[PDB]
Design a protein around this motif. Structure first.
Motif, PDB file in Angstrom:
ATOM      1  N   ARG A 189      -8.057  29.920  14.956  1.00  0.00           N
ATOM      2  CA  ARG A 189      -8.968  28.371  14.975  1.00  0.00           C
ATOM      3  C   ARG A 189      -9.482  27.867  16.235  1.00  0.00           C
ATOM      4  O   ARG A 189      -9.205  28.826  17.365  1.00  0.00           O
ATOM      5  CB  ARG A 189      -8.272  27.082  14.920  1.00  0.00           C
ATOM      6  CG  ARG A 189      -7.562  27.277  13.065  1.00  0.00           C
ATOM      7  CD  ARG A 189      -8.676  27.303  12.144  1.00  0.00           C
ATOM      8  NE  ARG A 189      -7.678  27.749  10.521  1.00  0.00           N
ATOM      9  CZ  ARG A 189      -7.798  28.409   9.274  1.00  0.00           C
ATOM     10  NH1 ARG A 189      -9.828  28.223   9.618  1.00  0.00           N
ATOM     11  NH2 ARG A 189      -7.155  28.605   8.624  1.00  0.00           N
ATOM     12  N   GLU A 246     -17.638  27.699  19.605  1.00  0.00           N
ATOM     13  CA  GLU A 246     -18.403  28.175  18.436  1.00  0.00           C
ATOM     14  C   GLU A 246     -19.556  28.665  18.788  1.00  0.00           C
ATOM     15  O   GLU A 246     -19.944  29.189  19.760  1.00  0.00           O
ATOM     16  CB  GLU A 246     -19.296  26.722  18.267  1.00  0.00           C
ATOM     17  CG  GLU A 246     -18.658  25.467  18.149  1.00  0.00           C
ATOM     18  CD  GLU A 246     -19.518  23.911  17.537  1.00  0.00           C
ATOM     19  OE1 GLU A 246     -20.569  24.364  17.218  1.00  0.00           O
ATOM     20  OE2 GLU A 246     -18.823  23.076  17.395  1.00  0.00           O
ATOM     21  N   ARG A 284     -17.238  32.080  12.230  1.00  0.00           N
ATOM     22  CA  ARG A 284     -15.961  32.353  11.148  1.00  0.00           C
ATOM     23  C   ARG A 284     -15.345  33.658  10.581  1.00  0.00           C
ATOM     24  O   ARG A 284     -14.772  33.052  10.359  1.00  0.00           O
ATOM     25  CB  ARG A 284     -16.886  30.970  10.116  1.00  0.00           C
ATOM     26  CG  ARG A 284     -15.576  30.225   9.535  1.00  0.00           C
ATOM     27  CD  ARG A 284     -15.363  29.763   8.387  1.00  0.00           C
ATOM     28  NE  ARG A 284     -16.408  29.190   8.045  1.00  0.00           N
ATOM     29  CZ  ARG A 284     -16.956  28.291   6.940  1.00  0.00           C
ATOM     30  NH1 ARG A 284     -15.677  28.758   6.110  1.00  0.00           N
ATOM     31  NH2 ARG A 284     -18.144  27.892   6.824  1.00  0.00           N
ATOM     32  N   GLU A 326     -11.882  23.314   9.694  1.00  0.00           N
ATOM     33  CA  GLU A 326     -12.032  24.457  11.214  1.00  0.00           C
ATOM     34  C   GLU A 326     -10.770  23.851  11.905  1.00  0.00           C
ATOM     35  O   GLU A 326     -10.396  24.067  12.505  1.00  0.00           O
ATOM     36  CB  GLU A 326     -13.196  23.847  11.777  1.00  0.00           C
ATOM     37  CG  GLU A 326     -13.985  24.900  12.451  1.00  0.00           C
ATOM     38  CD  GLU A 326     -14.279  25.488  12.055  1.00  0.00           C
ATOM     39  OE1 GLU A 326     -16.270  25.737  11.665  1.00  0.00           O
ATOM     40  OE2 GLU A 326     -13.172  26.946  11.297  1.00  0.00           O
ATOM     41  N   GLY A 336     -17.708  24.281   7.055  1.00  0.00           N
ATOM     42  CA  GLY A 336     -17.266  24.471   8.648  1.00  0.00           C
ATOM     43  C   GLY A 336     -18.433  23.849   8.929  1.00  0.00           C
ATOM     44  O   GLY A 336     -19.045  22.863   8.554  1.00  0.00           O
ATOM     45  N   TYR A 337     -18.176  24.281  10.535  1.00  0.00           N
ATOM     46  CA  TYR A 337     -18.680  23.187  11.891  1.00  0.00           C
ATOM     47  C   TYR A 337     -20.327  24.485  11.810  1.00  0.00           C
ATOM     48  O   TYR A 337     -21.290  23.591  12.147  1.00  0.00           O
ATOM     49  CB  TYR A 337     -18.126  23.445  12.865  1.00  0.00           C
ATOM     50  CG  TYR A 337     -17.318  22.236  13.348  1.00  0.00           C
ATOM     51  CD1 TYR A 337     -17.091  21.264  12.087  1.00  0.00           C
ATOM     52  CD2 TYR A 337     -16.422  22.485  14.591  1.00  0.00           C
ATOM     53  CE1 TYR A 337     -16.051  20.694  12.593  1.00  0.00           C
ATOM     54  CE2 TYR A 337     -15.031  21.732  14.110  1.00  0.00           C
ATOM     55  CZ  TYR A 337     -14.979  20.708  13.397  1.00  0.00           C
ATOM     56  OH  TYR A 337     -13.884  19.647  13.615  1.00  0.00           O
TER      57      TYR A 337
END
Lengths: 268, 250
Positions: free
Chosen positions: B75, B10, B66, B241, B182-183
């Motif tokens: 991913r 992340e 992203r 995701e 998304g996250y």
């Protein structure tokens, strides 16, 4: 509302589908549901399978709003706790507007609208009538004027009696309603309208309370300042008081003071 | 196993042209305070960014948003090979084109509004095939690098002439929409996402493992909380995701 619950089980959901379908095509549009409480009271009155299926159909239709299609769904009810909480979900009926009974100023505003066509006399004081209608809604004020109009009618052409399908204009233009006609309407049992918690602006100033200038300035520091000078409280960092307790012997204007201070701030 | 192959994690820096690395890792890989690096991943694709130092990043991980993530078609968890590329020189002229489904409603000078302030003395290293995202004007507009004069990769200088032919492009198959979930589109649910991810990470990313191992993964997860927190938003974010399929039941 009842129009949908009158249709047989099956045709009910069909009408709801057709409703959104017909209004979406005619965009922009406003879809208004009347007695929503009669449709989705999903709590203890959701007794049965047929009812639940009808509610879900609307729920899907509420979510079925593609947004890009510009339609807005409005509804009405007697009270918030009548409607199914699933409709309260932030994404369907997200915005809520409380429209309680009108106040003194409200009823005064309404009376002029219902008397905009009739010839009011000079002695007629609508502001007086609005003040003594302690618990009246819009519709009840209408019936007030109507029954008073009938009083003014049963004294004019009533003696003449013109059995016709069309009344002469000169006869109607000369007709007027007196203050006593409004008195007679109030005297009857028809102003018996539902009475709830009245939220209004006090029509009583400080002049109804003799002296006590110390408590006046005290009260202003507690309510006038945190609304007219919110920047000042943030400047000094202190937090406004949340309440005050009045103590003393009865009939010294404790109630009058609480009303008078609201009058200064022009708050409810 | 080659100490130059790292794992995408992340991102803390949501900038499109940045790749965060740990301090001791850049000393092993011989990277400088702004060296243009070259990333390779699955589906045989390349991407160019700028490496920076991240204290919160670990040695075996690399932070990226992203945009870079989708450009490599990978991913969170996939393998990428980073390598120093000091032969990257400045750009001359660059022809770029926007995507049709991201300009629906606005028109006019896209260069002065989005492009110019975006590359304004930023020295962003773009490459032919890369898809970057510029946010502004209370919305988001996606551009795809069609052709650059110093093929394949070059750096966008503030003197570099930026051409806009004004011709909308089609959406390819493997091009996931950046407008989706998304996250990085959910907040307030820190420990929630932490628990949720590590519960559905392994069984979703490697079904083969659990069909081979004698370990039982969680089948059903229930989400509490009052309405409006974004229950549905969380679920769809995981699927988008992890690449896993998503089917909703209203």
């Amino acid at each position: 509302g009842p129009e949908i619950m009158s249709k047989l089980a099956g045709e009910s959901e069909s009408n709801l589908r057709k409703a959104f379908e017909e209004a979406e095509k005619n965009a922009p549009a406003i879809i208004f549901i009347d007695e929503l409480d009669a449709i989705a009271p999903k709590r203890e009155k959701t007794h049965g399978e047929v009812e639940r299926r009808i509610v879900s159909q609307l729920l899907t239709l509420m979510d079925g709003l593609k947004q890009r299609a510009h339609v807005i769904v409005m509804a009405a009810t007697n009270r918030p706790n009548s409607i199914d909480p699933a409709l309260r979900r932030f994404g369907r009926f997200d915005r809520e507007v409380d429209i309680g009974i009108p106040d003194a100023t409200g009823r005064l505003e309404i009376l002029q609208i219902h008397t905009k066509n009739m010839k009011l006399a000079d002695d007629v004081d609508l502001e007086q009538v609005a003040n003594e209608t302690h618990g009246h809604v819009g519709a009840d004020l209408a019936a007030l004027c109507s029954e008073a109009a009938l009083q003014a009618i049963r004294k004019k052409m009533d003696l003449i009696d013109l059995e016709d399908e069309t009344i002469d204009a000169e006869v109607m233009n000369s007709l007027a309603v007196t203050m006593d006609d409004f008195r007679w309407a109030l005297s009857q049992s028809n102003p018996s309208a539902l009475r709830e918690t009245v939220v209004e602006v006090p029509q009583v100033t400080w002049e109804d309370i003799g002296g006590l200038e110390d408590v006046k300035r005290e009260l202003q520091e507690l309510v006038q300042y945190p609304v007219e000078h919110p920047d000042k409280f943030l400047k000094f960092g202190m937090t406004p008081s949340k309440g005050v307790l009045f103590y003393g012997p009865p009939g010294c204007g404790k109630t009058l003071l609480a009303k008078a201070i609201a009058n200064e701030c022009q708050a409810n | 196993n080659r100490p130059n192959r790292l794992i995408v994690d992340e991102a803390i820096n949501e900038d499109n042209s940045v790749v965060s690395l740990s301090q001791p890792k850049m000393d092993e890989l011989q990277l400088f305070r702004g060296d243009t690096v070259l990333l390779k991943g699955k589906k045989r694709r390349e991407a160019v960014c700028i490496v920076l130092s991240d204290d919160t990043c670990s040695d075996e991980k690399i932070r990226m948003n992203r945009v870079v993530r989708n450009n490599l078609r990978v991913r969170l968890g996939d393998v990428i090979s980073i390598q120093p590329c000091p032969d990257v020189k400045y750009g001359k002229r660059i022809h770029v084109l926007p995507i049709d489904d991201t300009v629906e409603g606005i028109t006019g000078n896209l260069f002065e509004v989005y492009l110019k302030p975006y590359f304004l003395e930023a020295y962003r290293p773009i490459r032919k095939g890369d898809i970057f995202l510029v946010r502004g004007g209370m919305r988001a507009v996606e551009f795809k690098v069609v052709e650059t004069d110093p093929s394949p990769y070059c750096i966008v200088a503030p003197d570099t002439v930026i051409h806009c032919e004004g011709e909308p492009i089609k959406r390819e198959d493997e091009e996931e929409s950046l407008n989706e979930v998304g996250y990085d589109d959910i907040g307030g649910c820190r420990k929630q996402l932490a628990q949720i991810k590590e519960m559905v990470e392994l069984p979703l990313r490697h079904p083969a493992l659990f069909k081979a191992i004698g370990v039982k993964p969680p089948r059903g997860i229930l989400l509490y909380g009052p309405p409006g927190t974004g229950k549905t938003l969380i679920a769809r974010a995981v699927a988008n995701e992890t690449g896993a399929f998503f089917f909703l039941i209203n």
